[PDB]
Amino acid sequence: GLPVMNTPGSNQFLTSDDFQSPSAMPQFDVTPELNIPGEVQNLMEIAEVDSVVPVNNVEGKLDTMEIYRIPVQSGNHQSSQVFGFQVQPGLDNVFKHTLLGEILNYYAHWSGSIKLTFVFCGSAMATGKFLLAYAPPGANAPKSRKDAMLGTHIIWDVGLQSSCVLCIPWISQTHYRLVQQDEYTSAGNVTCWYQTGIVVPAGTPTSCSIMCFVSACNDFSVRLLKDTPFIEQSALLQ
Amino acid sequence: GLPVMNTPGSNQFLTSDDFQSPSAMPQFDVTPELNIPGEVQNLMEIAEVDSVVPVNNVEGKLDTMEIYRIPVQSGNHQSSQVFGFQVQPGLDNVFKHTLLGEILNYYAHWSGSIKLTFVFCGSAMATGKFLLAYAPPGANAPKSRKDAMLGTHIIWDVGLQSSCVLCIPWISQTHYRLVQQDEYTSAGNVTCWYQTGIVVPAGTPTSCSIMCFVSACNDFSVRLLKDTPFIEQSALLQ
Amino acid sequence: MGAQVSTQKTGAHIIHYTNINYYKDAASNSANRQDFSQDPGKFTEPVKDIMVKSLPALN
Amino acid sequence: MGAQVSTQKTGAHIIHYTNINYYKDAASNSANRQDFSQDPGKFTEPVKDIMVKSLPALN
Amino acid sequence: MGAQVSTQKTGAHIIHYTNINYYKDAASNSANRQDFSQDPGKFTEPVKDIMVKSLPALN
Amino acid sequence: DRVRSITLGNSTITTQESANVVVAYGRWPEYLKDNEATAEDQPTQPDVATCRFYTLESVTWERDSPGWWWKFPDALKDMGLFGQNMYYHYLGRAGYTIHVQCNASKFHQGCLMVVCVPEAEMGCSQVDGTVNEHSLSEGETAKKFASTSTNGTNTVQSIVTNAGMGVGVGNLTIFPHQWINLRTNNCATIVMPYINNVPMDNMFRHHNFTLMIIPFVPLDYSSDSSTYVPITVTVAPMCAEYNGLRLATSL
Amino acid sequence: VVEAVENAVARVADTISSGPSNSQAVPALTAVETGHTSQVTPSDTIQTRHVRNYHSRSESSIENFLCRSACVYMGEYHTTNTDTSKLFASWTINARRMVQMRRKLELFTYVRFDMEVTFVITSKQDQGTQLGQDMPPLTHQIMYIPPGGPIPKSVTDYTWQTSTNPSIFWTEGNAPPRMSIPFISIGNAYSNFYDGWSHFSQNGVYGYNTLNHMGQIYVRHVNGSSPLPMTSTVRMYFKPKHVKVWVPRPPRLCQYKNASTVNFTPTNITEKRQSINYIPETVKP
Amino acid sequence: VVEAVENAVARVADTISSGPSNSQAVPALTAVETGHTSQVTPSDTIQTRHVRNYHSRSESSIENFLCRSACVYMGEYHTTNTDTSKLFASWTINARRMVQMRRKLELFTYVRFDMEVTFVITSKQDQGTQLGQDMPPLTHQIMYIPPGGPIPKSVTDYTWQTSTNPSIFWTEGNAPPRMSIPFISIGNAYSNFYDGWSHFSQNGVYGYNTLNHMGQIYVRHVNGSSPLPMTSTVRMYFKPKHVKVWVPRPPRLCQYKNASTVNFTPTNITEKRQSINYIPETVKP
Numbered sequence A, B: 001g002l003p004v005m006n007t008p009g010s011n012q013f014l015t016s017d018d019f020q021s022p023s024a025m026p027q028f029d030v031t032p033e034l035n036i037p038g039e040v041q042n043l044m045e046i047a048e049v050d051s052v053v054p055v056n057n058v059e060g061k062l063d064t065m066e067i068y069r070i071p072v073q074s075g076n077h078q079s080s081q082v083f084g085f086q087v088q089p090g091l092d093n094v095f096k097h098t099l100l101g102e103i104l105n106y107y108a109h110w111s112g113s114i115k116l117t118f119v120f121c122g123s124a125m126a127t128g129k130f131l132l133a134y135a136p137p138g139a140n141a142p143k144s145r146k147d148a149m150l151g152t153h154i155i156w157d158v159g160l161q162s163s164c165v166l167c168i169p170w171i172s173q174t175h176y177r178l179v180q181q182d183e184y185t186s187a188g189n190v191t192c193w194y195q196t197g198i199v200v201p202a203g204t205p206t207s208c209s210i211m212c213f214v215s216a217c218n219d220f221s222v223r224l225l226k227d228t229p230f231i232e233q234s235a236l237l238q
Numbered sequence C, D, E: 001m002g003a004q005v006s007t008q009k010t011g012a013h014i015i016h017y018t019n020i021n022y023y024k025d026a027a028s029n030s031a032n033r034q035d036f037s038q039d040p041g042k043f044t045e046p047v048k049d050i051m052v053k054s055l056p057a058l059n
Numbered sequence F: 001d002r003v004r005s006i007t008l009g010n011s012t013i014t015t016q017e018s019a020n021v022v023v024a025y026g027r028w029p030e031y032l033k034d035n036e037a038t039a040e041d042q043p044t045q046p047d048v049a050t051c052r053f054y055t056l057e058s059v060t061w062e063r064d065s066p067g068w069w070w071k072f073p074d075a076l077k078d079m080g081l082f083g084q085n086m087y088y089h090y091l092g093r094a095g096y097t098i099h100v101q102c103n104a105s106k107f108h109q110g111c112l113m114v115v116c117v118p119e120a121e122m123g124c125s126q127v128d129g130t131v132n133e134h135s136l137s138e139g140e141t142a143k144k145f146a147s148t149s150t151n152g153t154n155t156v157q158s159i160v161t162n163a164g165m166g167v168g169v170g171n172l173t174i175f176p177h178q179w180i181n182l183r184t185n186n187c188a189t190i191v192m193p194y195i196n197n198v199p200m201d202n203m204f205r206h207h208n209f210t211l212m213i214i215p216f217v218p219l220d221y222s223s224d225s226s227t228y229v230p231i232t233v234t235v236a237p238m239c240a241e242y243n244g245l246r247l248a249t250s251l
Numbered sequence G, H: 001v002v003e004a005v006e007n008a009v010a011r012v013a014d015t016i017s018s019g020p021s022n023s024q025a026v027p028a029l030t031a032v033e034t035g036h037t038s039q040v041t042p043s044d045t046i047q048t049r050h051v052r053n054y055h056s057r058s059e060s061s062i063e064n065f066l067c068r069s070a071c072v073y074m075g076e077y078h079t080t081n082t083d084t085s086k087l088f089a090s091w092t093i094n095a096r097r098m099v100q101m102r103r104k105l106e107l108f109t110y111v112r113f114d115m116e117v118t119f120v121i122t123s124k125q126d127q128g129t130q131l132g133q134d135m136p137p138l139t140h141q142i143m144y145i146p147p148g149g150p151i152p153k154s155v156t157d158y159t160w161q162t163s164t165n166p167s168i169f170w171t172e173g174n175a176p177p178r179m180s181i182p183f184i185s186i187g188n189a190y191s192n193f194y195d196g197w198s199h200f201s202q203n204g205v206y207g208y209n210t211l212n213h214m215g216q217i218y219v220r221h222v223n224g225s226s227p228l229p230m231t232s233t234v235r236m237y238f239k240p241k242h243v244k245v246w247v248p249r250p251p252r253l254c255q256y257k258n259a260s261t262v263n264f265t266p267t268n269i270t271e272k273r274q275s276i277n278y279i280p281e282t283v284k285p
């Protein structure tokens, strides 16, 4: 026959290869294709859908809906910070079980801009203004409205439009950051402060709540597939 | 299937082969190429860069900068030789740890012309002339200026231009010489003598030094890769 | 011989490959790894009246 | 079939070979051994004002 | 695909074969068995003045 | 042919005894362009307030001097608005013009090597130990080589023949470099572009390059010539860019 | 004949340069109550430079996400035993017993594809006081039985004739066996979730086990041998190809309980931290 | 379809004929202080004949210099033991433990390429007083784990399911396994030297170990066997291809000390001789 020679790699089983293989059912006739609504072509399509963030993940609230609600109230509370958290979309407890974090945890590298939407769920007679700020890394997190004022920020005015969008832009020295983030690939923090305060008329509740959604922008991508650490078993039949 | 027949060499691992092989990461997306300064395309490019030669490699100076300095002085010293050494760019102690020698020690055969540059580092008021000579092999090394005068030489006059270049041309019966040189592939020697002498005015130092650089010319090449004898270990984790 | 020649995956800042099909069933063919389409508006913008994004959402 | 025919390495003083790519990724291709370019002036002549080599360096 | 077709060795009183080169070096090619040249006069007739063979050698 | 003038910002350098100028790898500094950028926010470009000559402190070249080195950046983190911009941003980018000055009479003799070394990672004088940040750099003050082997905790192994890196010092000519030969010239000038494996980086965490000054031929003079001979460094950043504005960090 | 096929790579969008602004356009104000996700970019909210982005979303397509071999079953069987049922292994086909592949597939409501099936088979000498023998290489038989086929009773049953069932014979020491399977379901797609019953009176079997019905696998030794006992383990690996999926779903939060149901134990939303303001200090001397 | 590709060989420069001269052109006088290397040839300094030079600089290009397999790791692991951790081998990936490949790569500051990885695996019967058995051929599993993946605890850990991690299974007696790996780094090139810190306060981890982070390798036996003990050794070989390098550096003079640092012991510049004039006599009767 034709003379040949086998190279290293013969007779191995690589679980990510792509070869041709014989069919155990010759000439099988498959069921025709139906046009079902809602066909998915890329995982990033799921990542651009907003989902609610459990910002209030403190002790005693991990199994209640209060985990999603950020509290605010009227009176002089300018010195009190509203919330703050790190920007670690795949590692921090605040973000790792949202849709975006769930998609990221199948991968090792991510890149792109992130959208945070904030919605105010008070009565139609409450007014107020908030300052939403984002600080790139290199310094400690701000401890006052004056320090946070120096970063990338937006001043949200509550009105007939109930939702404001803070965009976190991709500011990084590398093209990609690790999903398992360390000191070297850090990305900074987000904080919120009272810009004026909440004012209400008589006969209205004085305490209110704000909610927060996260999603990915149209410049976002991931790479380097891996197994997720969120599912496990001890034996078969599970 | 198609009839074939296996030849000698099947199922071996040759460490210098070149075959195709399956990828364990299908469709991975690599980081874009950046245009960094200083791209290297050939090892010979490193060999044409001058580097300082430790000509004064005698006992007591192997760990000091004095190993690089050749001493000269005023007065009647015509009978004293300045320096001399063999032309063995990959084997002799004088040359084996310079850039050119370091590149050569990864190879077995070399060919081409060599450049030696000499720079005078005395005060601006010192004058003098030197004779730089190269003798092809076949005889013993000259013992006087008169004998060395008969070889390939240049008479260097110290002036506002501080550097003189002696070129050693490729004179050989074979196309290549062994990096591990023996009697059969010898190449000769270089020597230096006082042509007139060093003269200085009052108020100036009387002793001075000369330095020497080596590099390869534009007709130079090497072949027959091998491992180098300058690095070693006793166990892993080193 | 019914060969197909198509381009390889490379980077940005001799590159094509050939393929032959050997089996009579298309369920024996290798995976389709080089098709990259999207339609995100199906999930992110599923509304009847178009929203401009420079205009206010309501009113 | 997307074959490439190029010349073999020989000496100086029937000589070409053929190649086919089998895999979908270019990281699976064999080494690029037959490209010989140089730019030594990057390291040997990195000066702003050009030096003629027949003229004196200074003055 | 850079194939070569040449004639086979036969006798006297469907006969050709094909070859492909697979390796990048010509030192990997098979032997050159079908080249038959001669120049015997180099050893049998190495004289300055030509000798006719019908004429006497000397005189 | 020997005279030169260099202007940057509101600063100007003249010289009458120069040799030539070295452009590190034939590449002049330049700004980052769009098909090579990754960070998305619009950057700031101060452009005359940062791109100008700053002069460091001088050293005294004695008859027995092994040599000196500086680390860049972090030698310029307290120099005006360049340093202030370094404090407030996460990412920075810049090239440099370096100028070294040392004058002496026609009766002195000596020879200095001036070399720029990218990514000069250094070793500790305890083999199973690591260096402190203070041992690598004292800001605008130079660190000093030794003439013998060194001891001590957390300090750099600084015998001048190995250049703190485990190589032969006479090979440092593979890098961008010039020489100051006291009979020939009195200054050296090197233009260095931005050299990294990423388009931008943090200016506190990473030392981009080291400047080394090493006398190969020691300073020597006779009866009553001047004894005090100083060396001076002056560096100017070029095409400076910053990204990622937030509150000022603190060391 | 050669035919050129052109591949179009799809890279992500660039960012455009943007300057100051003072107008009535309000890109940042929205209303989530509509069910609409805002399509704003950094260029709408800050000042930006122009960037040419070359990144590609190639490794997050469905085909590249799903086309990787994964284990779905492991089983053991002996060469000699006194139980008559420990001499062969058998199971019902699905992808519900190993959690990684199951959870990955369950991000979508409906799926359709072909499969490439690989088997990995290993053997071992059983522990004993008397060891040492000279056995020839062992051979293995794998038979697939669609529903309604006769079932083997032992290792010498006539049913191993495999006249119409597809089988694989294999010898130890060679490369792992492999074959490809087309999309075989009486529906237009496989169903991962089914909120219904098997009986028209709204009772009987609930959920997934009503719809699958894709036969069984049986595996035996062929030698019929072994003076001293030995054990073999077979493992099955699945790889889907030519994929299509519909109707994405939120990923599984609770841990799996069994292979027949979606039953679970209540689990928290995430893990806790000290405070709603807490963020750790990392820049310290 | 066939496509011809033309290869250009690059040979070295010829030498031109040159005669006597008496002029003001001084090719031999230069000034090294400029940082410039003189481009003089023999024809500028002596009288020369014309030579047609046919030599080529083919074997000193970067690709031919670097494209050769080299060992980078060796490890051992047993079939049976009482330590539970000596039954598998594992390590963190780099090229810093074997000095030859390390020094060769370290002539350049930055490098970028693809890799071809080969494994060589051997086994042996452990020394004992009672020898002699009949084992089937041994099988080996190699699994690669990118950072963040679950880590195996033993040889029967669930993590060997390798649902998403790439693995190789192999049997003794066959050709050595092989696979190719693309350029995988979050930067634009691999970095061999890094003069910086991991923490923004200029402390923490110094140098190379800040930037690499490229996962781990685990290797085990598959049979789960061996009445009598046995030992296996695995060795890894790297070969780079499609190479690019930047910023050459002087070669390493001192001997290496560890794999995390550049630490060294002071070493001499070269070895000594008797005198600055000494050259041995070789032409004697």
Ligand SMILES: CCCCCCCCCCCCC/C=C/[C@H](O)[C@H](N)CO
Pocket (backbone or CB within 6 Å): A024, G093, G094, G095, G105, G111, G115, G117, G142, G143, G144, G166, G167, G168, G179, G181, G184, G190, G191, G192, G214
């Ligand atoms: C002789 C060896 C033959 C091997 C027989 C293997 C056939 C396996 C059954 C074919 C159907 C498997 C396709 C996937 C099944 C489920 O629909 C999916 N896991 C998701 O629902």
Ligand SMILES: CCCCCCCCCCCCC/C=C/[C@H](O)[C@H](N)CO
Pocket (backbone or CB within 6 Å): B024, H093, H094, H095, H105, H111, H115, H117, H142, H143, H144, H166, H167, H168, H179, H181, H184, H190, H191, H192, H214
């Ligand atoms: C299933 C077997 C898979 C084998 C996995 C081998 C992957 C090896 C890691 C890939 C990265 C290696 C590339 C070279 C690494 C370093 O950058 C270089 N040694 C120089 O820095």
